[PDB]
């Protein structure tokens, strides 16, 4: 989908509603309500919430 981000730091979360990820991971953004975004991992298709300051939007 239109909005793709790359992780800048590891994000570990003990909570099932969060998407945990590794630095350098690519994700699709699904929702930008405030600063906690909903995302899907490009690699696993796993979905959840992410802290938007852990991530950078890229062109294409």
């Amino acid at each position: 989908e239109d909005i793709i981000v790359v992780a800048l730091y590891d994000y570990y979360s003990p909570f099932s509603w969060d998407l945990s990820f590794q630095k350098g991971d690519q994700m699709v953004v699904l929702e930008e309500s405030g600063e906690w975004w909903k995302a899907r991992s490009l690699a696993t298709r796993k979905e959840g919430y992410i802290p938007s300051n852990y991530v950078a939007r890229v062109d294409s």
Partner: protein, 137 residues
């Protein structure tokens, strides 16, 4: 916590308070733990560090007795450890012999000792607001 950028700030909600207290209940570590200011600080800071909720939400109603959370959705309350007293039924001159608990020295600590207890009813019954509507307007 290991060094990482602080996750974004947001105010506590009924739903976050519900989900996190359910998590704590299912993972263990909090149910049956003795309350202290320091243990609460740890809990508050952990929720802040992992999820971004500013730690100014976890207030409980004043004692004595059970302390109920002001945040509707948070399913832990603080329960006194000492068993609840059976006020009846005082005797005569020999009451100290029949009831050792009434001997001078056996008195409860001036500060009530408390333990965290999960209570599923806190999800639907806002006890703090029933006891203290003045906290909410």
């Amino acid at each position: 916590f290991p060094v990482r950028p602080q996750v974004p700030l947001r105010p506590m909600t009924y739903k976050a308070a519900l989900d996190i207290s359910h998590f704590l209940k299912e993972k263990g570590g909090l149910e049956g733990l003795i309350w202290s200011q320091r243990r609460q600080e740890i809990l508050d800071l952990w929720i802040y560090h992992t999820q971004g909720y500013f730690p100014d939400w976890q207030n409980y109603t004043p004692g004595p007795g059970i302390r109920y959370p002001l945040t509707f959705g948070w399913c832990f309350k603080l329960v006194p450890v000492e068993p609840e007293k059976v006020e009846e039924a005082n005797e005569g001159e020999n009451n100290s012999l029949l009831h050792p608990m009434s001997l001078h020295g056996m008195e409860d600590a001036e500060k009530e000792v408390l333990v965290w207890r999960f209570d599923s009813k806190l999800a639907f019954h806002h006890m703090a607001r029933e006891l203290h509507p003045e906290y909410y307007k």
